[PDB]
């Protein structure tokens, strides 16, 4: 039961392009439900069968009108949410590249501490050579 080199990179691609998207796939359920419904009324079939969505109602067809307007706003708000999330990541990528760009006024603050911390080792290594010579005699 072997595989091929072509047969591996055909499943290495289906995984890489696989998306689940609940607001988009719910809108196309409404677009699909009306094209099959207005398909049959052109032909002439209209019976009391439960294979389709519904036959003829005032309330429940307007319930489909409410469902067509609710899922439209859920899809419209989700595209707006992906719009602002992409704009914000581009700004922080640019202001970090701006903070990385200059890096000249913040260099003198480090070299003060590193010249102060190199001073503090000069005393302790001189203190441990002062106490080490008074003990060597006695």
């Amino acid at each position: 039961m072997p595989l091929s080199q072509k047969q591996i990179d055909q499943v290495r691609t289906k995984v890489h392009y696989s998306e689940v998207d609940t607001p988009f796939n719910k809108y196309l359920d409404i677009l699909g439900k009306v094209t099959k419904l207005t398909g049959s009324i052109i032909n002439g079939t209209l019976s009391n069968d439960d294979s389709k969505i519904e036959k003829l109602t005032e309330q429940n067809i307007s319930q489909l009108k409410e469902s067509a307007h609710l899922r439209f706003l859920d899809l419209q708000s989700s595209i707006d949410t992906k719009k602002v999330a992409d704009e914000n990541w581009e700004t922080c990528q640019q202001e970090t590249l701006a903070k990385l760009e200059n890096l000249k006024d913040k260099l003198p603050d480090i070299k003060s501490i590193h010249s102060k911390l190199l001073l503090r080792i000069g005393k302790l290594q001189g203190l441990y050579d002062s106490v080490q010579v008074i003990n060597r005699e006695v």
Binding site: V34, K65, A68
Partner: peptide
């Protein structure tokens, strides 16, 4: 979509 859905409503008056 909305132009089709009102035609189905006036079929159901």
């Amino acid at each position: 979509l909305l132009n089709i859905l009102d035609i189905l409503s006036v079929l159901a008056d």
